[PDB]
Amino acid sequence: QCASSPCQNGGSCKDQLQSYICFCLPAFEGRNCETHKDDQLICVNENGGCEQYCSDHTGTKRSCRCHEGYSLLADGVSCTPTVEYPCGKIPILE
Amino acid sequence: TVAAYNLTWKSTNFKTILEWEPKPVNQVYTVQISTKSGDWKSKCFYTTDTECDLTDEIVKDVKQTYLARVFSYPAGNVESTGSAGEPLYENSPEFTPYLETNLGQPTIQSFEQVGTKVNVTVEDERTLVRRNNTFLSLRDVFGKDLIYTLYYKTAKTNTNEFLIDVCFSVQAVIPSRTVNRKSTDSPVEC
Amino acid sequence: IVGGKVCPKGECPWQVLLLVNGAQLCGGTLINTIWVVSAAHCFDKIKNWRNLIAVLGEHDLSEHDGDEQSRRVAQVIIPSTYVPGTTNHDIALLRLHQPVVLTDHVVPLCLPERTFSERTLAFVRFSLVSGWGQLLDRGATALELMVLNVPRLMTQDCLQQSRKVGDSPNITEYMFCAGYSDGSKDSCKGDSGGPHATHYRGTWYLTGIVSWGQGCATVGHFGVYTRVSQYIEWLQKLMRSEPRPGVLLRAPFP
Numbered sequence: 001q002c003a004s005s006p007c008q009n010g011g012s013c014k015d016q017l018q019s020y021i022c023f024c025l026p027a028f029e030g031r032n033c034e035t036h037k038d039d040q041l042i043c044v045n046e047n048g049g050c051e052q053y054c055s056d057h058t059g060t061k062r063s064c065r066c067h068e069g070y071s072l073l074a075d076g077v078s079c080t081p082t083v084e085y086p087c088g089k090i091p092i093l094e
Numbered sequence: 095t096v097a098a099y100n101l102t103w104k105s106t107n108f109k110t111i112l113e114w115e116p117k118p119v120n121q122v123y124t125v126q127i128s129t130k131s132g133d134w135k136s137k138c139f140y141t142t143d144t145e146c147d148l149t150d151e152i153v154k155d156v157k158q159t160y161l162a163r164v165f166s167y168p169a170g171n172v173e174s175t176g177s178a179g180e181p182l183y184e185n186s187p188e189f190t191p192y193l194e195t196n197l198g199q200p201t202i203q204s205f206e207q208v209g210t211k212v213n214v215t216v217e218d219e220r221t222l223v224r225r226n227n228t229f230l231s232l233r234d235v236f237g238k239d240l241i242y243t244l245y246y247k248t249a250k251t252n253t254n255e256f257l258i259d260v261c262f263s264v265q266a267v268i269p270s271r272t273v274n275r276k277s278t279d280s281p282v283e284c
Numbered sequence: 285i286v287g288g289k290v291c292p293k294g295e296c297p298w299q300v301l302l303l304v305n306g307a308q309l310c311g312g313t314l315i316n317t318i319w320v321v322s323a324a325h326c327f328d329k330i331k332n333w334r335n336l337i338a339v340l341g342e343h344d345l346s347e348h349d350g351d352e353q354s355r356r357v358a359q360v361i362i363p364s365t366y367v368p369g370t371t372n373h374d375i376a377l378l379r380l381h382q383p384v385v386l387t388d389h390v391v392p393l394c395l396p397e398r399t400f401s402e403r404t405l406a407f408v409r410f411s412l413v414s415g416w417g418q419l420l421d422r423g424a425t426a427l428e429l430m431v432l433n434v435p436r437l438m439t440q441d442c443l444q445q446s447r448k449v450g451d452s453p454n455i456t457e458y459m460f461c462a463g464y465s466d467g468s469k470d471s472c473k474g475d476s477g478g479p480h481a482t483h484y485r486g487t488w489y490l491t492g493i494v495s496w497g498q499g500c501a502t503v504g505h506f507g508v509y510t511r512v513s514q515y516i517e518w519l520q521k522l523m524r525s526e527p528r529p530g531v532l533l534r535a536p537f538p
């Protein structure tokens with residue numbers, strides 16, 4: 001049943017009654033391991049991995065941005081307060 | 095724009111897929127899945143497929159109950175009910191992997207026929223559940239919850255091994271299950 | 285707040301208490317040193333505007349520790365599509381006469397970008413509503429700040445789970461419901477105008493405003509809030525532009 005090698009991207013196949021099951025490598029998902037995890041850096045997906053603001057760009061990588069009172073860090077995703085009392089932070093807990 | 099319907103969970107060995115209908119006529123879908131009080135997480139963005147592999151999300155806690163919902167969009171878009179100003183969606187049934195996933199058809203591996211007795215052993219088959227990039231086995235996930243059942247008239251064990259005396263098919267079983275209690279018969283051997 | 289907890293002092297530092305003549309009116313949220321966001325319907329009666337007052341850093345209403353700051357409210361701006369007595373478009377923006385001073389105890393809530401708010405914050409499940417309103421549908425208003433965590437619902441779920449009622453208003457695209465329908469936990473009268481606030485990776489963001497209600501903690505119903513994401517660019521054009529004369533202002537919306 002696995003005989004047609006349907007798991008793409010390096011995955012293993014284990015045949016079942018009336019079908020199969022693909023065990024994917026870490027970076028892949030999908031019935032047939034056809035779905036590229038590395039490959040959906042978009043804003044509607046966990047916020048583009050941005051800490052605050054996400055901008056999708058035509059043809060290029062999404063960029064992250066920050067609220068006022070905040071500036072973007074080296075890693076390109078995190079924000080850091082640039083002021084004393086940043087909005088939406090609780091100083092008693094900070 | 096049409097709402098998905100007949101949303102169903104197809105799951106074996108924790109490998110988990112949600113399927114629904116209809117096949118998209120100028121519309122795409124996105125799935126959201128979540129535990130009963132987690133945030134929602136998107137998968138399968140703007141697909142024209144009518145299925146979504148949710149295995150990665152559900153194996154993160156197999157004892158939780160998950161709800162998925164599937165959104166429909168035009169063309170085109172990105173908006174909206176109109177009406178409520180949100181995407182049209184529809185909800186899956188609830189799903190609790192540890193209790194509903196189909197046990198995969200096991201496979202007998204070993205038949206050493208020692209004395210007056212044959213010792214037929216069943217294989218601890220790997221599941222889609224990972225710990226550290228590597229895959230846990232049926233025994234790792236179910237422990238004392240999983241027993242087996244031999245036809246050879248019938249026997250039974252709760253280890254991965256039987257032992258009888260002077261044909262052979264098995265059966266994974268989780269007795270505490272309200273549903274999908276019994277696996278399917280291993281391919282018959284001797 | 286029905287069914288909540290006392291918010292420990294300074295853990296809701298953007299909480300505003302609105303008073304007229306020294307009497308409780310409403311909640312509000314501090315979004316910067318001079319701008320507070322509230323609920324339009326709180327201003328439906330208001331005899332003398334001279335004394336509108338906002339209190340910041342307030343916690344225990346019955347006495348007076350370091351932290352409170354009071355300001356006359358210079359202007360109340362409400363959308364021009366809000367109709368007194370009805371439920372739609374229940375947002376007000378208030379200009380304080382002088383800025384408050386930010387301290388441990390007084391801090392603005394982030395007014396998020398709209399598409400961040402539609403896309404990410406709308407799917408964070410739990411958010412906090414807070415206030416000094418009634419602790420039960422017919423009961424006593426609170427005296428220490430109450431806080432409650434409710435789950436948000438998409439409107440289709442809201443419409444599906446709620447008992448139908450003769451003449452209950454439409455849940456519009458400017459509204460959403462979060463709360464429980466088993467009758468245990470809700471926002472209540474006098475919580476109006478304050479915040480439903482969403483925590484996302486370490487920073488908190490207005491997502492909603494307490495608005496209206498079939499009673500409070502009524503079996504079969506959820507709390508309804510104003511969907512702040514619809515009014516973000518309205519809020520911002522108003523904060524950026526030039527002060528106009530008058531106390532109540534009806535500003536065009538969109």
Ligand SMILES: *[C@@H]1O[C@H](CO)[C@@H](O)[C@H](O)[C@H]1O
Pocket residue numbers: 001002003004005006
């Ligand atoms: C490869 O072959 C299997 C059956 O062995 C088939 O169902 C797959 O769809 C195909 O790609």
Ligand SMILES: *[C@@H]1O[C@@H](C)[C@@H](O)[C@@H](O)[C@@H]1O
Pocket residue numbers: 010011012013023024025
């Ligand atoms: C089977 O398991 C999968 C995950 C991959 O390791 C394959 O290379 C292997 O054959």
Ligand SMILES: [Ca+2]
Pocket residue numbers: 342343344345346347348349352
């Ligand atoms: Ca006090």
